[PDB]
């Protein structure tokens, strides 16, 4: 189980819209991304906080070129969770550190399309989708590393989504330690 719903209405509705997969990416292409992105990130301080930042504990980048290897894993991304759908010219690279956490948020209507997707590495945390209108409706998703999960339509547009901070971290009752965590994030275009 890696979807936890408030109830089967949730879980109808958002089936074939909020997808994880676990084992999307093999051990050797998790250490091929982790390879190429850690000295990147590695020259760049985790920046100031600020509370009306959806994001917390963080430093990033944006990835345009890569190493055959790499372009191999976006390709397969790009197969599995965009349809016939143009990507953005680059992809996000988000490195959390173990106090790190994501708060509540829709990514933004205005300069991301339909669908996003995410390769998670190097620890486990917890996405959880809130909808906007009904805090009663949600889903929880446990992401492994070396996972995928796409978001579209109602997952995209009318859930917030958030990575829960150490102290938060549950997925059900299972306690989800937090380490720090890269991810890799391909939004389509508007
Ligand atoms: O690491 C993730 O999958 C979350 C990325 C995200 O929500 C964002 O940067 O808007
Ligand atoms: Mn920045
Ligand atoms: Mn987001
Ligand atoms: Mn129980």
Known sequence: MWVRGSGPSVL????????????????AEEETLSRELEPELRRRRYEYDHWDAAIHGFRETEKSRWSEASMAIMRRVQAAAFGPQTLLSSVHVLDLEARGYIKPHVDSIKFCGATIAGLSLLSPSVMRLVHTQEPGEWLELLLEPGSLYILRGSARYDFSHEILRDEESFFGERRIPRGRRISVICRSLP
């Open 12 to 27: 109808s509705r958002l089936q074939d819209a909020a997808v994880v997969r676990p084992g999307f990416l093999s051990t």
